[PDB]
Every structure is written in C-alpha cells, then in structure tokens.
C-alpha cells in the first residue's frame, strides 16, 4: 500500500510549494498596495465623496470632465464677448473733434437749438450716414422765426466764416431733403446744377453722441459683469484641471492595485494553513 | 572989426568939436563892423552868390524860403504815401490759412483745375465778397466730365470729409448763381427752403491771391521809390533849414551894420580935415 501513502505526501509539498510561492508574490504586492492606499485616501479626500469601487472612480471622473469642458467653453465664450466690448468701446470713444464752441454761444444767443443736439438722438448705424449727408450744414442752428438773427445779423463779427441756419421746430423738427446717391462709406449729393458734394462717412459722426454715449455706458455695465463671470470661470477651470491631473497620477500608477483585499489578510491566512500542512507532514 | 575975426574962429572949433565927436562914433562902429564883415563873407560863402546889397540878402532869402516850404510839403506828402503803403502791404500779407493740401492732390488726380486757382485772378475789392459767396464750395474742384471721379469716387478714403465738385470749362468758366442778399461785410444766401447760410467777408479771401500777390509787388516797387525820394527830400530840408538859421543869426546881429562904407575911410579923411582946421587956427 506504499503508493497511496507516499503519493499523498507529495501532494502536501506540492501544495506547500504553491502556498510558499503564492505568499511571496503577496509580499512584493504589499509595498505597492501601501503607496496605492495613500494616493486613494488622498485623492478621495480632495473631494467629499466615497470610492468603494473602481467604477466609482470612473463615474466621478465622467462628471469631472464635463464640469471641465463646459467651463472651458464658457470661459472662452465670455472672454470672447469681453474682448468684443473692449473693442466696441474703444471705437465709440476716440473723439473727432472738435466742433466749434462759438456755435454753442450763438445758438444760445438766438432763442433756439443746435442741430448737433436735435439729432444727437439718432441711431448708431444711421448717425454716420446722416452726418455725411447734411454736408457743412451739420452744425446748422435751428430757429423758427429767423427774425432774431436778421436783426443781430449785422452785429455779428467774430462768428465762423460760414454760418448755417434753418427754420424749424426743434421739438418736432422736419427733416431736410436731398438729391442723393448713397455710396459705400460715402454719399454723393447734387447740391446744384453741375455741382455735387462728396462727404465720407465719419468715424465719430456729429449726430448721435447721445445714443452713442448711451450705448457706451451699457457696454461698461456689461463689460464689468463679464470680467466678473470670467474671473469665476477661469478659477473654476484651474481648480478642475487640477483635479483632472490629480486623477491621472493615481490612474497611471496606483489604480490597478487599489480595490484589492489587503495582502496581509491572505498572507497570514495562508501561513496558518502552511503551518497546518507542516504539522501533518510532522504527524 | 573984432567981431568977424573972433566969430569966424568960433565956427572952426564948432566944426572941430563936431569932427571930433563924429569920429569917436565911427570908432565904436569899427569893431562891430568888423564882426559884421566876417559873418557876411561867411554866409555869402556858404552859397555861390554875391551880396552887393542888403536887398540881395532879402532876395536870396525869399527863394530860400520857398525851397524850404515846398521841400517840407513834398517830404511830408511822400512819407504820408510811404506809410500808406507800409500799411497796405502789411494787410495783404497776413495769410489765412490754411487751405487743405489734399485738395491740390485730388485736383491733379482728376484732370482738372481748382477753383481757388480759377478765381485766383479776381479783383481785390471783389475777392472778399465772392469768397463769402460760394460758402464751403470755394474750394470746389472744377472738372467738365465728372466721369473720372465717379470711377475713382469709391476708391477715395482719406479725402477731407466734405468734398465739393463742379462741372465746367476751367479755361472759360461759367459763374455760379445764388439767391443772395448782400449785407455789409457779410452775405446771406438762401441755400434751400427754410435754410440760409451767413458767410462773413474774410480778410485774406480764398479767391484772388494772384491779383493780390501782384498788387503786393507793385507796392514794394513804389515803396522803395518813395523811401528813396523821401531820403533826398529830408536831407534837402535839413540843408535848407541849416541855411535858414544861418541867415537869422546874421540878420539879428550883423545886418544893420554891414553894407556901410568902412569906418576907417571917413576916420582918416576927417582926420586930415581936422589937421587942416588946426593948422588954420594956428596960422
Ligand atoms: N441709410
Ligand atoms: N459786389
């Protein structure tokens, strides 16, 4: 019967050579599973959440990446709009410049209103065109009687060499009328027989500083709201890309190892089992 | 007979007391008639003439005084005219100033002439009025086709905001026409319905720098001819007023005495006569 008793003994060593080498691997495993556990606590500490599983890690990260891309399009979109205003404003600001002061004085002299002020109200898209339109008549003074001037007309001496005057109701003024051919960024009026004026569209037109200055305020409001939202976004992004890179380090290095049962658990268990085997080889 | 012989003797002393005192006066006379003769030679030396008589002195002086007054009205009249030119010139010179250079460039661009040059020819009395007249159309460019511009019209960018153009023959240009009311040192055009322009007469009008610059030359010519004649006159006057005062000194002091027969002539004559008397009182 020697065969059952001898072969039986083999199988116990056979196993013990397995438990021995099996344990040895768990020992290489430990130090790495240590570093792995550190990184996992740390990264899981960076945000209030609990990672029981590796799938949790992948889930928190799907969300992390949307937070990121969305924040990057908004911060980019905002700053785009911000710069579109930094620019806008710049344009409406440079002033030409300079209308004559004397005119203000004469319009005050004769009861009545300036035209720079009557049409100070006009729109931004229209303002440049209408300035070219009235030719040198832009700074005309509007007075309904034209009687005050005729009297004080002789008196005036220092007035600008050409003075333009128009009889109308400043409160409800009735637009002029021209023989005109509109050209790109310019206008061509037939002022008379065989005579024509070409006036370019100005940057900073006489007419419409009031609707203009008014837009320029609205742009400052918006700009400061943008720079405020931009600040919040760009921080938000930096913080997110910082947790992005957080996950990568961990993913590339410690992710496989973690979510394993501690090595020591099986190392001590296998050991009491190998001691049990050795005792049976002893008995 | 004692009476004839004694009384006869008296009359000889009687006379000798006359010759004695008569001679004494001639002696006071001499030194003064000396100084008188010096001044007469001297003054008669100052100008090539001969004074045989006191009437000669009065005659040369009538002439001297006309030379003087006439020279003083001419020198005064000349300098009056000179200063009327120093002034004139000053006025035509101060330049306003300044017409746009770009215009020159554009008129060269389109075959054709400027209006500042078409009317550069006008008169001085008319120039200021016509400048006020054309309003801002003074610097218009005259071109007969108006075709070159329409093509290059779009291209133009930097041109002054208002550009004025007129189709005519620069060589034989046909004046514009306005609805105008002429005012003192100003003009009032009805440019349109319910619209009027007031342009003051300029000092230094755009039109007529060519008839102006041309007058200004003629004034420099004349001015230098005046300052030349003025120089000759004013010297001539100084020299004359110097001979005027020459005559006065002499007139006030030595004129009575001169034109007398030398004292010594009668002093020696009377003396041989008083010696003859004394010899008869002796005999
Ligand atoms: N328009
Ligand atoms: N005139």
Curated annotation (Swiss-Prot), chains A, B:
Q: Which domain of life is it from?
A: Bacteria
Its subcellular locations are: Cytoplasm, Nucleoid
| Region called Flexible hinge, residue ranges | 95-212
List every stretch annotated Sufficient for ParC binding.
74-233
* Domain comment as written in the entry: The hinge domain, which separates the large intramolecular coiled coil regions, allows the homodimerization, forming a V-shaped homodimer. The N- and C-terminus together form the head domain.
Please state which protein family the record places this protein in: Belongs to the SMC family. MukB subfamily.
**Subunit arrangement?**
Homodimerization via its hinge domain. Binds to DNA via its C-terminal region. Interacts, and probably forms a ternary complex, with MukE and MukF via its C-terminal region. The complex formation is stimulated by calcium or magnesium. Interacts with tubulin-related protein FtsZ. Identified in a complex with SpoT; IscS and ACP. Interacts with the ParC subunit of topoisomerase IV.
Tell me the function of this protein.
Plays a central role in chromosome condensation, segregation and cell cycle progression. Functions as a homodimer, which is essential for chromosome partition. Involved in negative DNA supercoiling in vivo, and by this means organizes and compacts chromosomes. May achieve or facilitate chromosome segregation by condensation of DNA from both sides of a centrally located replisome during cell division. Stimulates both DNA relaxation and to a lesser extent decatenation activity of topoisomerase IV.
Q: Output this protein's name.
A: Chromosome partition protein MukB
Look up and give the organism this protein is from.
Escherichia coli (strain K12)
**In the UniProt record, what gene is named as encoding this protein?**
mukB
> Where in the full protein does the shown chain start and end, and how long is the full protein?
572 to 854 of 1486
